[PDB]
């Protein structure tokens, strides 16, 4: 089967064949599209075909499909599965697997970088203290004094689902949020629930607008333990504007390292429930969403005030105007401090080139338009005009339940 996508700006038409390898479901049916919906222990019987499918892909990628080495590895994995009910990946397969989960991530605009990923194998980790050490090392490596390097740290895979390794933080670096008795919020309103958990677990909260949350780390299914990332490892950037000298006095800053820690990495049917990964920011993530969502720092009003825009009616476009200036400030600040960041024009243009390269060399590039298009200035980026096909390939990154909802407390 062949599927065509068209770019309505250029009339370029691409043909997808890679979708034939899709597996998991989309949520959609012939009667309903769930394209804008955000959210969607394994028997030996289901495990070996998953392992085999993965190993066939791995061995094809290294041009050894059907080799004695390929056949021996399948044999070895089959035996390990029937004997032990699971299997262990070779370091080469783990690295291949992690890179392809990123390559396959349909919501990621940054995938041109997929083959450049430092993989830290933490499968020998046994305690929350061990996890803390591995994560500090990841943060320091990935930060690299502002010259950011993509990385992922992989903790031991799931066994019976009662011994999961989990990082309870949704992201490695995030600011606390505090609900006040008057209903107002101090800090990042997105993190109020998690902050309360940390405090309950014994964290002494400074109660400021930008407090870096402690790590809450769960090893081998045990109760999670709190750790504070060394402050000297947490790179932050004070936000200022190149023309507006008063912008600095907003008191804004952000951290340099975007590091997602709540997702699950699936490779060959194995499940890595703790696999924190990091790259570098696209400016809009901070300037548009973090700062300007009504449910986040919500700074549009204050900024527009200081610009003395007409705020009496929406049609003056005061919000749009302030939004651009904020996003200029973010890019300017990171650049000035030599912390890696990419603007939404650069990133989407690079993505289009990546996507076209993938169509040619791979037969497709699954992509979720809803997430790929930036949250400001959508149609003046090339991705807006690009038809995309969303489907799910493995290896993959998946959502998983929040650990506080499923954890059985030891006490």
Ligand X SMILES: CNCCCc1cc(F)cc(CCc2cc(C)cc(N)n2)c1
Q: What kind and span of H or E run contains 16?
A: strand 13-16
DSSP-assigned letters across all residues of 51-113? HHHHHHHHHHHTT-TTSHHHHHHHHHHHHHHHHHSS----HHHHHHHHHHHHHT-TT-TTGGG
Residue 155 · residue 275 · CB < 8 Å: yes
Would you call 107 a catalytic residue per the annotation? no
282 binds ligand X (CB under 6 A): yes
Q: What are phi and psi of 217, to 5 degrees?
A: -120, 130
Smallest separation, CB 68 to ligand H4B (Å): 45
Query: Which of the residues 9 through 28 are near Zn ion (CB under 5 A)?
Result: 28
**Which residue in 97, 110, 256, 287 binds ligand HEM (CB under 6 A)?**
110
Give which of ligand HEM, ligand H4B, a copy of itself, none residue 277 binds (C-beta under 5 to 8 Å, depending on kind): ligand HEM
For ligand H4B, the closer of residues 59 and 281 by Cβ is 281
For Zn ion, the closer of residues 136 and 370 by Cβ is 370
Residue 156 · residue 123 · CB < 8 Å: yes
Residue 205 · residue 211 · CB < 8 Å: yes
50 binds ligand H4B (CB under 6 A): no
Would you call 108 a catalytic residue per the annotation? yes
38 binds ligand H4B (CB under 6 A): yes
Give which of ligand H4B, ligand X, Zn ion, none residue 384 binds (C-beta under 5 to 8 Å, depending on kind): ligand H4B
Closest listed residue to residue 110, CA positions, set 281, 263, 257, 360 = 281
| Active-site annotation holder among 111, 158, 166, 174 | 111
Give which of ligand X, a copy of itself, ligand HEM, none residue 171 binds (C-beta under 5 to 8 Å, depending on kind): ligand X
Q: How many CB atoms lie within 10 A of CB 398?
A: 15
CA distance 287 to 168: 26
Would you call 232 a catalytic residue per the annotation? no
Q: How many CB atoms lie within 10 A of CB 34?
A: 12
Locate 343 and state its tokens: 């603007």
CA distance 35 to 25: 12
Give which of ligand HEM, Zn ion, ligand X, none residue 33 binds (C-beta under 5 to 8 Å, depending on kind): Zn ion
| Binding footprint of a copy of itself on the chain (CB under 8 A) | 3, 5-6, 8-10, 19, 22, 25-38, 283, 288-289, 292-295, 300, 314-317, 319-321, 323-324, 327-328, 331-332, 335, 343, 345-346, 368-370, 373-380, 384-391
40 binds Zn ion (CB under 5 A): no
Tell me whether residue 320 is exposed, middle or buried, using C-beta atoms within 10 angstroms of its C-beta: 0 to 12, 13 to 18, 19 or more. Answer: middle
Smallest separation, CB 98 to ligand H4B (Å): 21
CA distance 411 to 409: 5
Query: Which of the residues 9 through 68 are near ligand X (CB under 6 A)?
Result: none
244 binds ligand H4B (CB under 6 A): no
Would you call 168 a catalytic residue per the annotation? no
Closest listed residue to residue 142, CA positions, set 45, 39, 256 = 256
Residues lying near ligand HEM in the complex (CB under 6 A) are found at 102, 105, 107-110, 113, 117, 150, 152, 277, 279-280, 282, 285, 342, 347, 371, 397
Residues lying near ligand H4B in the complex (CB under 6 A) are found at 8, 36, 38, 370-371, 384-387
Residues lying near Zn ion in the complex (CB under 5 A) are found at 28, 33, 35
Which residue numbers are catalytic?
108, 111, 280, 285
């Amino acid at each position: 089967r062949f599927l065509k996508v068209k770019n309505w700006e250029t009339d370029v038409v691409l043909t997808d064949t890679l979708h034939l390898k899709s597996t998991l479901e989309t949520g959609c049916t012939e009667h309903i599209c769930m394209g804008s919906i955000m959210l969607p222990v394994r028997t030996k019987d289901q495990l070996f075909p998953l392992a085999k499918e993965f190993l066939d892909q791995y061995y094809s990628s290294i041009k050894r499909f059907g080799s004695k080495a390929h056949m021996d590895r399948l044999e070895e994995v089959n035996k390990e599965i029937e004997s032990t009910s699971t299997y262990q990946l070779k370091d080469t397969e783990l690295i291949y697997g992690a890179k392809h989960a990123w390559r396959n991530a349909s919501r990621c605009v940054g995938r041109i970088q997929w083959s450049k990923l430092q993989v830290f194998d933490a499968r020998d980790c046994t305690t929350a203290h061990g996890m803390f050490n591995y994560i500090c090392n990841h943060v320091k490596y990935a930060t690299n004094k502002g010259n950011l390097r993509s990385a992922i740290t992989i903790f031991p895979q799931r066994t019976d689902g009662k011994h999961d390794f989990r990082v309870w933080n949704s992201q490695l670096i995030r600011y606390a949020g505090y609900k006040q008795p008057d209903g107002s919020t101090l800090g990042d309103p997105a993190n109020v629930q998690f902050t309360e958990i940390c405090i309950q677990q014994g964290w002494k909260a400074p109660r400021g607008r930008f407090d870096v949350l402690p790590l809450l780390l769960q090893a081998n299914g045990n109760d999670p333990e709190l750790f504070q990332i060394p402050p000297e490892l947490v790179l932050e950037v004070p936000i200022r504007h190149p023309k507006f000298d008063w912008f600095k006095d907003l008191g804004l800053k952000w951290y340099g390292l975007p590091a997602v820690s709540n997702m699950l990495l699936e490779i060959g049917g194995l499940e890595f429930s703790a696999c924190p990964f990091s790259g570098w920011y696209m400016g809009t993530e901070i300037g548009v969403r973090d700062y300007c969502d009504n449910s986040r720092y919500n700074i549009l009003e204050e900024v527009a005030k200081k610009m003395d825009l007409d705020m009496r009616k929406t049609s003056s476009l005061w919000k749009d105007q302030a939004l651009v200036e904020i996003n200029i400030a973010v890019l300017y600040s990171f650049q000035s401090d030599k912390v890696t960041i990419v603007d939404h024009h650069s990133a989407t243009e690079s993505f289009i080139k990546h996507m076209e390269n993938e169509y040619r060399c791979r037969g497709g590039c699954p992509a979720d338009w809803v997430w790929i298009v930036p949250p400001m200035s959508g149609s003046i980026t090339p991705v807006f005009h690009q038809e995309m096909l969303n489907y799910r390939l493995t290896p993959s990154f998946e959502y998983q339940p929040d650990p506080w909802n499923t954890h059985v407390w030891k006490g």
